[PDB]
Structures are given as C-alpha cells and as structure tokens.
Amino acid sequence: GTSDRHLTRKIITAWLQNGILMDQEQKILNGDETLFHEESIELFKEIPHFYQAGKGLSKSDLFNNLTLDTILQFSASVLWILNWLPGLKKAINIDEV
Amino acid sequence: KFDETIDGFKTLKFKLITILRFNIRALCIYDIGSFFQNTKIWNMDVGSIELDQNIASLISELRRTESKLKQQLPEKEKNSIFIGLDIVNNYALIKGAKSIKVLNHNGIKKMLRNVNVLQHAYRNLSSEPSKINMNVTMNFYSLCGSSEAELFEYIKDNELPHCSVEDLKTILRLQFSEEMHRQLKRKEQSKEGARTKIGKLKSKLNAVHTANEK
Amino acid sequence: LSSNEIVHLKSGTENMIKLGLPEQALDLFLQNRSNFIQDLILQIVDNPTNYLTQLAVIRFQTIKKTVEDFQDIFKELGAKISSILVDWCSDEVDNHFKLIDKQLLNLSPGSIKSSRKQIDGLKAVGLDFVYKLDEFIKKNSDKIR
Amino acid sequence: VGQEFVAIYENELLPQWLETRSKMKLTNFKFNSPIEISMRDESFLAKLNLG
Amino acid sequence: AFPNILQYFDDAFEWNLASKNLELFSLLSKMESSIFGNYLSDLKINLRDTLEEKFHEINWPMYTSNSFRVGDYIIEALMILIVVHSECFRIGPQLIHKILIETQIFIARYLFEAFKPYVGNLSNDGSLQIIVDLEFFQKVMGPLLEKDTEATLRACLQNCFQNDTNRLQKCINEINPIVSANLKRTAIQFAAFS
Amino acid sequence: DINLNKATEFILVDNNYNSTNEFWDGLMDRLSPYLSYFIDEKLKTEEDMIKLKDFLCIYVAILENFKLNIEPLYKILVSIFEKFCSVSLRAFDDEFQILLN
Amino acid sequence: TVQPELLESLTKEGHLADIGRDIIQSYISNREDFNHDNFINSVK
C-alpha cells in the first residue's frame, strides 16, 4: 500500500537495501548463523536510530505497525506461495516440455 | 518458466522477509515500554519488585504470535525468521536500551529480572540453540549494573561482543557514574570518582582494545 | 473440526458412528479436543506456580471429561477404541511434561502438588500417570527444591 | 429477550458455578480455568436458543 | 496365491502342484519368520528396558505403604503393551495382536520372574511388607491372558522365600481387596487389554 | 444472531465481517457511553454501578466467547473502576469525618 | 478549507478522498497558498 499516503510504513521503510539486500543474504539459507548484529543492528537500528530507542522516544509501539488483520492476510498469502512453489515450480520437465 | 519460478521465489523472500520484519519490529516497538518506563529509578526505588507490564505484553503477543505462526505456515521458515530476528533484535534491543536514564542498584535487579524473563521468553520460543543474548545482554546490562571500573577493564578484556562500546562503555561509565551523579544532592556530585572516570575514561575506557580512544 | 460446543460434537460424533466410521470419528474427536486444549492454553507464564496449576487443570480436567464423553458416546464400543483413547491420553500427558520442561529454563514443588493431585484426578476415572512424573522428578531434580 | 436469555444463562447459572466452584483453588478466577471447568450441563446455550 | 494356483490349474492340467513350487510359500514362511520376528524383536528389546524400572529401586529396601498399585514395573510395561496392541488392532485385527500378546505375556513373565531370585530371601531389602506388594503387582498380570502364562505366574508366586508357606497364599487371598482397589483405579487404562 | 453463519454469503472476510460490526459499534457508541458514564458518573453513583459492572463484565466476558472485545471492555470498565475508586474515595473517611468530629 | 484547526479529519471524510491521497491536508495545494505552514506532514 505504498502509495505512502498517508503512512510511515516503517516496515516498508525497513524494506531498503543494503539492509534489504543483506537481509536477502540473511534470507539466503536464511543467514546460516551469520546473523550479523552488524546487519541486524545496522539496518534494523538504522531507520530506528531516529529516536533511537530512545530515550525518550519519538518511535514505535502502535506507531504504524501492521494490524492483526493484515498479519493474518500476510501469513495467509505466504502460506499460499509456499503451497504454490512446490506444486507449480516442480513441472519444468526440461526444457520446453 | 525460470523467470516465472524465479519471480515466485522473489515473492517468497519478500513475504517471509516481511514476516520477519513484522516480528522484529513488534519487538523493537515493544522495547519502547521502557520509553517511558516512568523514570527507571536513581540508585534504588526499593522496593523495586516487578515487572514493566509492556514487556509482559511483548511476551504475550510474542507467544501467541508464535502459536498461530506455528499453526498456519511450515516449521523451518518459522524457526528461521523467529530465530535470527528474535535473538538479534533482543541483543541490540538491550544495546540501544542502555541509553535510558540515571540508574538504580535495586532497579539493576529489576531490569535484570525483566531481561531474564525475556530471555526465558525467546528461550521459550527456542533455547536449545545459542540463546546467548541471555548471557551476553545479561552479563552486559549486569555489567552496566556492575560499577567496578576494575571489572570495566577486566570484562571487555575477556568477553562482551559489545560493538556499541563507545556508548556501552560510556553507559556503564554513566552507570557507576549514574550511582555517583546522584550519590549526594545539592551535587550529586563532585565528579571525583568521575575524575577517576575521566582518568578511567582515558584508562579504563580509552584503553579500548588497542584502539585506545574511548 | 470447528465447533467449540458439545451438542453438534456429540451429535455428529454419534452420526459418524451411525455411518459406521468410528475409528476415524474418534480420531477426529480427539483431534478436536487436542485443538481445544491447545487453544485453551492460549489464555495467560505470568509467574510460575500459578501457570503450572492452571495448565494442569486445563489439560487433565478436559481429558477426564473426555473420558466421560467417551464411555458416553461409544456405548459398548469395546476395548479397541478405548485403546485409541489411551494413546491420546498418554500423548497429552507427555505433552504436559514437555510444557513443564519447556520452561525449566532459568521452580518450587507446590507446582508438583498441583500436578500430582490432578493426575490422581485422572485416577478418579482410573488412570495412573504419576510414575511418569516420578521419572520426571528423577531426571529433573535440579530446581525441584 | 435473547440477550436476557444469554446473560440469564451466564449471570444466573455460570458465575454461580465458578463462584460455587473454586472452592478448590482460590484466585485465579472468572477466567480460562473456569472457562475450562464450566463446561457443565447448561453449557447447551448457543445451538438454537436465539437462532 | 493358493487360489491363484488352483485357478491357475484351469486350462493348465499340469498337475496343479507339486508344493515344491510352494517353496516360494516356504520362502513366504521364511518371510513371515522375518516379519513378525522383526517387530517382536524390538518390542521385546523395548521390554528389555522394562528391567530399568523394576531393578532400579523397586523391590529395594521397600516399605511400599499399600499403594494399590504402584507397580511401575508392571505399569509402564503394560502401557507400551497396550500401545502396540492399541495402534495395530484395527487393520491387523487378530494378527499378532493376539499372537504377540501371548508371546508378550511369555517374555513379560520370564524376564519378570528372574528378578525375584536375587531377593529370594523374601524381605529384601525392606520387603517384609513389600512381600505383599510384589504379591500385588504379581497379581496385576491377571488381566485377560492365558493359563500356562498364569502357571508361570503362580510359579513366580512361590519364587522367593515366603513364597513357600501357604500363609502367603491365603494371606494374599486376603490381600485381594487392594488388588480390587487397583482394579477400579486404574481400570479404564488397561481395560483395553480385556 | 449475526455470527450464526453457514459462511459466507459476503464472503468478506472469510468469517471476518462481524468483527468490523461490533468493532465499529464499539467505536461510535464508545465515546457516547464514555460521557454517559462520565457526566453521568455522578449519575452512575456508588449504588448499582456495582450492578452496572456486574451487568457489563459478564457481558464483556461471554462475548463470542471473545472476539476483539478489548477497548470498550478493558478501557470502559477500567474507567468504571476508577469511578468506584473516586466515589468510594470521597465516600471514605472524608465521609467519616464525623469521627474527626 | 484546510486551516490550522480543520485540516486532518474533515479532509479524511468519506468523499473528501476526492482530495488527494497525500494532498488531503494539502487539498488547497490547488490554490495560491497550499496549506498554511507544513502542508505535507501526513504521508510519512
């Protein structure tokens, strides 16, 4: 829904490379236990350096988290794509069959 | 069909990425129960029992969130997103969480006990793996509650992967100091042990792991 | 697989028997009480001895009620179906100790008094499981004190 | 009428039970445990009585 | 495949058999010998861990103050007995549910009966009262099984020192009431073995 | 008798529509019941206000056996307990200053 | 008519989404002056 208009979707703000890019490297195996506090603290605290915590914040806890409805939505569709990718990514049957 | 299934893979990493960001930002959201925790006390507030209700909420919706997430989806992704994002954001959550206020020797045991409870919580998600943010942040915020500058030299010469050591060492400095800086009142204080932490700011702090500057 | 109540559950249970699919029927029923107790756990550790006492009361009390539901519903349905019930019982008892150990990760034995009292509550309809708790004590004797 | 049947059932019957019980365990009350134990006869409420 | 052989003697006037062809069936016999003897291995192997219960602190210096029963010797044993007879009595009904039930009463009874030997002096090490407890858990195995199994059972009733007087016999015939107390709690668990 | 759904003839959401209903009727009539319990806290006196909570928390509780009943249920009855706090509070030893007399 | 007291929720009305998605508070960005000292504090 971005189209920001009118929302600081800080999740979507946290969809920013290289934190998203190394987050895909942290989605690779996922990360295979190189769960870099460099990466996690850097990107996940980088936009969240805005207060930072802190102190005395200007920050989250109902400031624009996803609702439970949108959570059950996103969980639903991710269950769908998981059920999709085996069943529909199987049949590639090399290479035009 | 490789562009196709490639794109479906890209939606998979985008979606599971979004779920991991959702749980992790639910945590970093939830740490703002400390902001404000209504004046985390100076040198004591004894007693000093328990338990910063917002953190119990964090344990609660964390627990139910893992309940339903274990209900719908498959196991391995849940262990992945929850494992990495939970433990890492727990650790750095304590790290930036150190920048708070004047500090309490009883409230050291309070926020210590709360931090041990959240260690029991993310442990209750998964503990057989390296649930070391328990050990790291417990000995690190306990090390903040430690006020011995000799321990400040001794610890971090042996332990504490504490990459915020500028603010971490300045914060345990601000914790022995946060006991000092309202040990009296007017003054509160003379900064003579903080003359020993100006010198120890040069010595117990700016002997910082051969980058001797903190 | 959807109703939190009793009457449809009772009814379509004995209707499923009235088809004559009783084994699948019982297994679905036990699955409904599994999901039931499962989701009953979703109301809340706050602090431990309370939490354990709570937890035991849910699980065992519902199993005992499920036994009266069983002999209720499966009138002269023999030994075999009862053995399937013994399977599900023992499963859930093991799941209980798994949830006990699931936060030993940090106890005081009044918790255990709650547990063994309610397990004798299952001995009100005649099923011992205390010995599993005895081996639980045996191999978990660190923070029992 | 239906609401008065409902809060009739809970307020008249159910809290009489969960205060009548417990009586075994102090408090801890009016909650998930009494949700679990009551669960008795005259739980048969929501099948047809207003529907 | 017998009826496939008889109906395979249709046009087929070979003779019909020659059950040296049924060497294959004898092979099936050997396959059957490999089959149940596989699983009746492992259950017995699991019942070998039965000896972890009753040797460790059971029939030890045992007051055994009238818990009726407390026979974790017999309890967990008959539990996993009824677990195997639980999860296979539907499709394999009156398979080695029944046959392996009888053999389970056998291996049960024998690996039981050679534990009373080392405490043949019948109060070891506190078992003046737990004489009646081993009499009780000894009486627990009268659920539904055969008689030669009960013969070896009552043979193990006379196994220890006393266990030789008839005072033990009529005394346990008076101790039958607490066995009836175990026969309602616990009833419904091992009621499936009936 | 809304959520008796052989579901769903909407189908929106797949059993999530009535959540929006008692959600919104929670929302609009919330601020009206607010002042109706605040103005009207004086007209919710230390009498059957106990029977008001007794006739609300039961109906806060046997709900669906719950479905989203939070902000009305927690916040409203919370403020009702604040009202019994203040009403019993001034009804306390200020109203026993005859013992001071 | 987004002045400094009537700019947020009257622009967030039903058909007041005929004003812009980030130009609800800046609904008078179609004017000379846009929305009187920080028109654009909504989309973030």
Swiss-Prot record, chain A:
Q: Which family does the similarity line name?
A: Belongs to the SEC8 family.
Please state which portion of the whole protein this structure contains, as first and last residue out of the total length: 679 to 775 of 1065
**Subunit (UniProt):** The exocyst complex is composed of SEC3, SEC5, SEC6, SEC8, SEC10, SEC15, EXO70 and EXO84.
Q: Where in the cell is it found?
A: Cytoplasm; Cell membrane
Function noted in UniProt: Component of the exocyst complex involved in the docking of exocytic vesicles with fusion sites on the plasma membrane.
Name of this protein: Exocyst complex component SEC8
Swiss-Prot record, chain C:
Q: Which portion of the entire protein is included?
A: 604 to 753 of 753
Q: Summarize subunit and interaction data from the UniProt record for this chain.
A: Component of the exocyst complex composed of SEC3, SEC5, SEC6, SEC8, SEC10, SEC15, EXO70 and EXO84. Also interacts with SNP1.
Subcellular location field:
Cytoplasmic vesicle, Secretory vesicle; Bud; Bud neck
> Which family is this sequence assigned to?
Belongs to the EXO84 family.
- What task does this protein carry out? Involved in the secretory pathway as part of the exocyst complex which tethers secretory vesicles to the sites of exocytosis. Plays a role in both the assembly of the exocyst and the polarization of this complex to specific sites of the plasma membrane for exocytosis and to the budding site. Also involved in assembly of the spliceosome.
Q: Which gene encodes it?
A: EXO84
Supply the name of the protein: Exocyst complex component EXO84
From Swiss-Prot, chain F:
Similarity comment text for this entry: Belongs to the SEC15 family.
Kindly give any further remark recorded in the entry.
Answer: Present with 4280 molecules/cell in log phase SD medium.
Assembly and partners are described as: The exocyst complex is composed of SEC3, SEC5, SEC6, SEC8, SEC10, SEC15, EXO70 and EXO84. Interacts with SEC4.
Its recorded name reads Exocyst complex component SEC15
Provide the organism lineage as a comma list.
Eukaryota, Fungi, Dikarya, Ascomycota, Saccharomycotina
Its biological function? Component of the exocyst complex involved in the docking of exocytic vesicles with fusion sites on the plasma membrane.
Q: Where in the cell is it found?
A: Cytoplasm; Cell membrane
Q: From which residue to which, out of the full length, is covered?
A: 406 to 506 of 910
Swiss-Prot record, chain G:
- More info: Present with 2340 molecules/cell in log phase SD medium.
Can you state the subunit structure given in the record?
The exocyst complex is composed of SEC3, SEC5, SEC6, SEC8, SEC10, SEC15, EXO70 and EXO84.
In terms of domain of life, where is this protein from?
A: Eukaryota
Family to which this protein belongs = Belongs to the SEC10 family.
What's the protein here called?
Answer: Exocyst complex component SEC10
Q: What does this protein do?
A: Component of the exocyst complex involved in the docking of exocytic vesicles with fusion sites on the plasma membrane.
